[PDB]
Amino acid sequence: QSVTADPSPPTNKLNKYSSRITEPKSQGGSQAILHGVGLSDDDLLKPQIGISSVWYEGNTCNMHLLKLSEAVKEGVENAGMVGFRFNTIGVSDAISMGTRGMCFSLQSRDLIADSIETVMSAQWYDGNISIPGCDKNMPGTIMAMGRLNRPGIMVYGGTIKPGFVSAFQSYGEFVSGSISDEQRKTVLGGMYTANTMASAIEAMGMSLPYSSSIPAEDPLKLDECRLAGKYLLELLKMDLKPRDIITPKSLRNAMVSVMALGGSTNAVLHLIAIARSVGLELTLDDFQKVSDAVPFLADLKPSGKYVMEDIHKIGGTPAVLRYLLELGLMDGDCMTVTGQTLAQNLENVPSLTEGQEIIRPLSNPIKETGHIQILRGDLAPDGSVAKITGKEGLYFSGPALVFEGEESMLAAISADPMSFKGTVVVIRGEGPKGGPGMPEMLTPTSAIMGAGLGKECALLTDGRFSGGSHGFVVGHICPEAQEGGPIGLIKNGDIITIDIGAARIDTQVSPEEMNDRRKKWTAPAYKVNRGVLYKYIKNVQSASDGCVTDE
């Protein structure tokens, strides 16, 4: 699809965009500012690289990205190019989890895409090198490269080596009586959104090999930063652009890595948004097809025992992708940011170390199909997402326990946990527009497990859940309750039946009484009327569409 968003270049030149301001004499004012920032007359002939970091001091996953940004600029200069560093904003989910600040989390991804797109277009930079952290910005930088279609490389900031979930669990164990206060003070990584997206983006071919597996402050991470300029100079010579690297086949390669590694359900939203940014289509059914074709082979947290550094020891992400390619699960002809295809990159990487117990064989997988399950039915007619380990059974049925927010659900389970036994808990009003921002909720699952109701109740929402309750936990239910979807018409006592085999969330209420409720339903007032969250409400699409905001 023809994506018209950003300026076009004014053929074998390496400064196709920066020559708009460095070569014409009518742009003498642009050259004077470039002379002011330190560019010589010979510098005006070189390509200009926009170096976009997501550095801020309020998160361990971003506090050291300015160091990486400085090494990237040095590598760009060593490649004979000009480096212009700029920095965008970012928020920490570990800080805001459990508060209204989570309403600002998911929208920051689209804010970051708009930020990099804005600077790259106004300053006429030729290429981009983005450095996101081990938080959840990553897809935002890829979305910006897709809009611009200028050569770019994503440098993952790296995952912090092990010493947040243990610190979040501390309050539950303290209240339950497992640990004391002192043990709680002492407590105060795996395949979550950060490691899922980094590994998927590398499998997508938009990050250099080993980028997703090298730890944060490993000396090799700085070495990767100083080499990004060399690879990007090659991409400018070939004019290998993001829309040449992000194809339906590379999109499937990223989906394969998510299913094989047990990636987060947030990858559904992010990969759909990334696919839309290059004019491609990616539906929930595409995820079910890849899920039913790729087995779970990865004994990593939260589902398993190991973390990302353990992957790094046994050969890193390229060793894992080499194994999947040898099993015929990935398309190796896809071009990458190395100037070569995926198979040419993987042909000369050390295989998984002998005797590794992280990556299971095809003979003995953790699960024969993928963890991601797309569920529809009467209550989620437009789709929903759930993480299924295969060990919880195929069915669950029970009366509905409906809550209009995460807060009222936590006050009920605290005051009467036994009234939750055998129920299908519905936390609605948490979607992209009703939240707003579609917040991620970790406390509902933890409170259910701390009450001893892990396998004795289900959990549905039009928002997002972080962890699993060893039962049935479903999110992304579309249409959301704010939009008048069936999830907004459920009443207490309604018998809800989840069928994993049929991939349906159904209600015993007849479709005629369901339509009777719909005719009487009025939309609740928006929780905000100003600010960035109100613009999100005015712009965001549904969860099944990746919550894109620019369509």
Place this chain on the structure above:
Amino acid sequence: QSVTADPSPPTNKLNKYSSRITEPKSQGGSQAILHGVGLSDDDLLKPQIGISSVWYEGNTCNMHLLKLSEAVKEGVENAGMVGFRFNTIGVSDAISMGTRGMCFSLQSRDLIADSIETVMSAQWYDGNISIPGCDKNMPGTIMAMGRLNRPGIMVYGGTIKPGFVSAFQSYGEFVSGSISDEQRKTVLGGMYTANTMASAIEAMGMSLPYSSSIPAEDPLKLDECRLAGKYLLELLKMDLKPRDIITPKSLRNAMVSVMALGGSTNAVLHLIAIARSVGLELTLDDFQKVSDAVPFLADLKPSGKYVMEDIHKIGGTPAVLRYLLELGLMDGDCMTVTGQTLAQNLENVPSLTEGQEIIRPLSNPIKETGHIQILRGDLAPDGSVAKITGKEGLYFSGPALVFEGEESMLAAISADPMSFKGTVVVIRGEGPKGGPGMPEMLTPTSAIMGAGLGKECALLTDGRFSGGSHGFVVGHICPEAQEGGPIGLIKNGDIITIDIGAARIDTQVSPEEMNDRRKKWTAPAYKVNRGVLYKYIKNVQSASDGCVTDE
């Protein structure tokens, strides 16, 4: 008006917001990350200050803001508080002037407001210290403080001392024959948007005294940065919030400083957007009233001879505001970020140095009324803005010469400059939605002057012009041509009459034929369908509304 946008605090505490994550035991995961970034147990009791810089390496007006940000964090720590630095994006108009990159300029102001609002809300910071550059971001930081209504101080980065307009003029003089190529290479400050907004925001009371007049890399600028934490600690003790400082009277104080200093017409858009962010109203008529009440007394560029450093020598901005206050033009009871009122701040500042020839007396002003004129009429029924020196006469009439963009106007004046003689030049399709982004255009005025047609033709647009042509130059014409306003119905040969006395832009075409054209008019297709500029088209209001996007 009740502005509901950002989270509310969970009374005499100084950490009203950060205590949401530092004090509850259910937020143990938030405290672990805070321990990871270096906070001790005693640090969890202190207020948390969000330090938002607009640093990037591609502009002289922002390349040194990281140094200021580091000094601000040191001052915050010296005041016994915690400082969290984060950085947002920003674009340079001097780089993108004359290119399609200017379409991304004005929208970056609203992008910056969304950026700071996002970080402050998710991280639960108690206060803010923003450091914008001598580009045009400044109102964006104030808009974010108004949405949050948490104590905040704006630290102006400072204006660069004199060695861009001379570099932009170089091509015109080279083509005309005034200078050669070598003289042009050698060439490759005043009251423009940066100095206008900084001085207006200081007069508004949201910047410490002398902030707008101290040069960029003056040693006193670092001293101001290290003192912002002390003043903000006082604002937290008084709980003096932006909506206590930004009032209808302080809004008028900023408007008075714009009229007295001959500020840019962009201050109309920015001050309206700032007023909306605190739930207040500010119309174009309010600007005409202040304009007709405050005389132009300021011999500064581009209208005069001197620059901002000359103001700094004769006493800086506080000396100018003290003079206006003594003439009874400003309300001195307005609270400021110093914990005191404007009059208490100005009572003990050195007056204008004896013998200064920059600030004219009330007896001999440069202009008896303000430079800003609000024009309406048949062609701008919803308003328009123009800068009037008072020396160009009251009337202009001529046949219309219509262009659907800046590019087609420059190709015509280059090929046939004499066909412009005596015409009313109309460059339409450059508004907030038709541009898109409402770009600023400097080349139309320069090409008209270089052709010797400065006083022999007029200039109208639904976008923005930067400089004056010594004639009649009008922008912000509402409704814009994309919205089907009368500016989009003008045909070549239409007699347009500008009447400054009546404040009207009228056409000789009867209102019946005007409505005949309107019934046949169809909206042109949007120039983009994806990206941040398409979200701008979906969100932006009219120019008379300040081009706000969150309503």
